[PDB]
Design a protein around this ligand. Structure first.
Ligand SMILES: CC(=O)N[C@@H]1[C@@H](O)[C@H](O)[C@@H](CO)O[C@H]1O
Ligand SMILES: *[C@@H]1O[C@H](CO)[C@@H](O)[C@H](O)[C@H]1NC(C)=O
Ligand SMILES: *[C@@H]1O[C@H](CO)[C@@H](O)[C@H](O)[C@H]1NC(C)=O
Lengths: 106, 50, 50
């Protein structure tokens, strides 16, 4: 079982700057089987990225992945107030599609 | 008294190149003896099916 | 070497331990194209360019 640990648990602190959200795994993520998710408070998560860096429909390319091996990046190029939301990771390598613990939770 | 190779005038330059093989270094006589011939080296070179 | 001055070495006339590029798996990528990591890897190669 491949556990995922998001490293910046509360780095955001109502951020006004570009971010470097991270995820790390016990066994290296094989073939970029990772995704990111946008869980706006009081609402369901919305897919943000798939593969390593492949973007999503209706999500601006300002959201940028930058991972390989231990896939670890979600980079907000220009930060907007509405996009604030706990961001989750999920790996499709071996694991029963397990998730991380969330990086942008108040 | 020492016979050593000094000049090698064969080729100028090469851009592409596919096969290189160099044997292990050794020593050779290179001196010119006087008398009758004493060695015969026989070779056969063939090229078939690549 | 630096990327612009890519260094090439020719691996010629030696058997190869094709069981040498993922068992360490230090390498993030052992992504093979066409040959794949398989017995075909551990097979005859005309020339090997590194
Ligand atoms: C097992 C395989 O398919 N590739 C591997 C990898 O451990 C490595 O990079 C190498 C040393 O060159 O050892 C072998
Ligand atoms: C001795 O012979 C070598 C050839 O093997 C030559 O290079 C060298 O110059 C010679 N020594 C002198 C003092 O000329
Ligand atoms: C070397 O190989 C390339 C590859 O096709 C070829 O274009 C070129 O003419 C060859 N010769 C030289 C001298 O570069």
């Amino acid at each position: 079982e491949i556990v995922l640990t998001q490293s910046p648990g509360t780095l955001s602190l109502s951020p006004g700057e570009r971010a470097t959200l991270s995820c790390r795994a016990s066994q290296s993520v094989s073939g970029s089987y990772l995704a990111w998710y946008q869980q706006k408070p009081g609402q369901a998560p919305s897919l943000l990225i798939y593969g390593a860096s492949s973007r999503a429909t209706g999500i601006p390319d300002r959201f940028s992945g930058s991972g390989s091996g231990t896939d670890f990046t979600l980079t907000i190029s220009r930060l907007e107030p509405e996009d604030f939301a706990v961001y989750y990771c999920q790996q499709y390598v071996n694991s029963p599609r397990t998730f991380g613990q969330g990086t942008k939770l108040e | 008294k020492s016979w050593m190779e000094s000049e090698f005038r064969v080729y100028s330059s090469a851009n592409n190149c596919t096969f290189e093989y160099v044997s292990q270094p050794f020593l050779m006589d290179l001196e010119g003896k006087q008398g009758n011939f004493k060695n015969l080296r026989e070779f056969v070179f063939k090229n078939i099916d690549g | 070497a630096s990327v612009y001055a890519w260094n090439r070495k020719r691996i010629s006339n030696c058997v190869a331990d094709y069981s040498v590029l993922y068992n360490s798996a230090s390498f993030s990528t052992f992504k093979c194209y066409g040959v794949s990591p398989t017995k075909l890897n551990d097979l005859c190669f005309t020339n090997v360019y590194a």
